[PDB]
Nucleic acid binder design. Structure first.
Lengths: 110, 56
RNA sequence: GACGACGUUGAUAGGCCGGGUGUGUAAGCGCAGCGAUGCGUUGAGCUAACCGGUACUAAUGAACCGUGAGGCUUAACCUU
RNA sequence: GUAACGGGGCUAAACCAUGCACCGAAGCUGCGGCAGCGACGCUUAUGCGUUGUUGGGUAGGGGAGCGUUCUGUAAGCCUGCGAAGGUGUGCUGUGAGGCAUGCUGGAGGUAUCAGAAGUGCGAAUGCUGACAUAAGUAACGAUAAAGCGGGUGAAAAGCCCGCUCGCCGGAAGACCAAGGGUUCCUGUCCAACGUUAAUCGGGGCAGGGUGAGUCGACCCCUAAGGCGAGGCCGAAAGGCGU
RNA sequence: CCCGGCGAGGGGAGUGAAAAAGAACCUGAAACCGUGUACGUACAAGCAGUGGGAGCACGCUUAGGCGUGUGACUGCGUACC
RNA sequence: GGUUAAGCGACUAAGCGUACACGGUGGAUGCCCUGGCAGUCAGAGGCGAUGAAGGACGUGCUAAUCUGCGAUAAGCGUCGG
């Protein structure tokens, strides 16, 4: 059986986060945690917290066992953008986009 | 200076084929403390090769 | 990126020891002079990337990837 | 860059004369289907039995239809035993289209025959909103410069404390007018704002702070100039001036 | 009640006909961006389709040799206003 | 069955394409009206030195804005419902 954890409206573009997510797809939870610990990326911290939350939900709500868990599904989706104005030379103006994303993690005994 | 035609999404994916990043092959184990650490680096507790280096 | 050398059964890099090279008689003390200065100790002191040596410091035991005799048909051969 | 047979190659696979075969088009013939215009059968509120012939097409002329919103027929008919809309599948007509049904949706829809139009979009460097590309590329605003220890904290190259180093010093120091209008002090918070992080801030929220007979304004006096009782002048408005 | 910085954001429980009606809230189309499965693709040259067509996967079938997805190889072919 | 030689030969996907399934972003479509548009039949066609039109500042158990009101300040007296 599956358990889900999510983090919506994260301040990071989906392209940057997807790089970290590909590392742990299909791996065991114990091995996945070690990989994220020694990755020097900002997105690694964000993904680590989501993974830990999913594991915690398993025992309290589903009564699973740590040793039998592994990462079955993981994906990132684009979120709403924020509009800002950046002045340029000669009186011209430019539009700036600040992108967000949604992070989903699924852990199962399969 | 600028493009004449819009590149396709297929061409975009081809360029990013070298963007994947690699993970650490393995981690070392201290002979005394017992916890994992990066090779040739001190442990979080403050050990290195079972010597207990300064851990202020 | 790549390519070459080495990792304790070790001269790979730094330090250290000796030499070379460059600059040109350090500091301290003594003597002469009213003094600025001069002379002796003294070709002295200092000296990067160079040459010949030396395990004092750093190069850790492990772990990871890669397997387990390698298709079918025909001819000559093992058994010219 | 062979470059004066399209190529390979050819002594016939070249040229001249004669003869017989075959290849070759949406042309002609064969088989099935649709439509226009003619004469005949006096058929017929007209379809055919037949019977000839025709059917590339811009500018442009003539004929016949599909679908959308609204009014009557309708106090009718369908519908919570599931309406409109959205998304699939099957069938059907020469075409614009039509019919049935699974899932989603949760309250309206409308036959037939007539009537009226804000009645059909790919283009006009068309108008408004949303989202791509270049690309995780350029850049992060004076080349006066930073190093270490301790503290707080989930997290410290940037905040607080301490010791060194560097820069300005007729200013990059100090006090005001003009202008702005709470940016001033203390506690607390980190979403957004700060071209990075942030425990920090001229950022968010709450409370506190400006004490005059002598400083300034008001007040008395006038310069340039403005307004101006009567007055002079001008179609009206109005102009000049004691 | 649980993970997290007495955060942001989530997983249960509960309310309701419905929470894929949770306040970024009725219905929720298109451009655009992702995860999973089947087939094709690293000696082959051009408006990317069309006619022919092997192999593979899957659903059927009184094997009825049919339907659906993919498309090695080959003839022809230089968008629209 | 063994050795040698010749001929032929599937299994790879760093990435990409088509189809289907499930999502994100975005706010079209359908349904809805305490808002608008055009008229018909009747009212009233002026307000002001007894200080107008339009404004400033105040007014609550009240920190802000809107409505009402004016130091008698979301109100006072009297006659009716």
């Amino acid at each position: 059986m599956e358990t889900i954890a999510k983090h919506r409206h994260a301040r990071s573009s989906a392209q940057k986060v997807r790089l970290v997510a590909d590392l742990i797809r299909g791996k065991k939870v114990s091995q996945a945690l070690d990989i994220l610990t020694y990755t020097n990326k900002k997105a690694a911290v964000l993904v680590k917290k989501v993974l830990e939350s999913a594991i915690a939900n398993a025992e309290h709500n589903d009564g699973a066992d740590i040793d039998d868990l592994k990462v079955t599904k993981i994906f990132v989706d684009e979120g709403p953008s924020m509009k800002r104005i950046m002045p340029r030379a000669k009186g011209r103006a430019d539009r700036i986009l600040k992108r967000t994303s949604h992070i989903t993690v699924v852990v199962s005994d399969r | 200076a600028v493009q004449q035609n819009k590149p396709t999404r297929s061409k975009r994916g081809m360029r990013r084929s070298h963007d994947a990043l690699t993970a650490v092959t393995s981690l070392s184990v201290d002979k005394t403390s017992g916890e994992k650490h990066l090779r040739h680096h001190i442990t979080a507790d403050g050990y290195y090769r079972g010597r207990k280096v300064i851990a202020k």
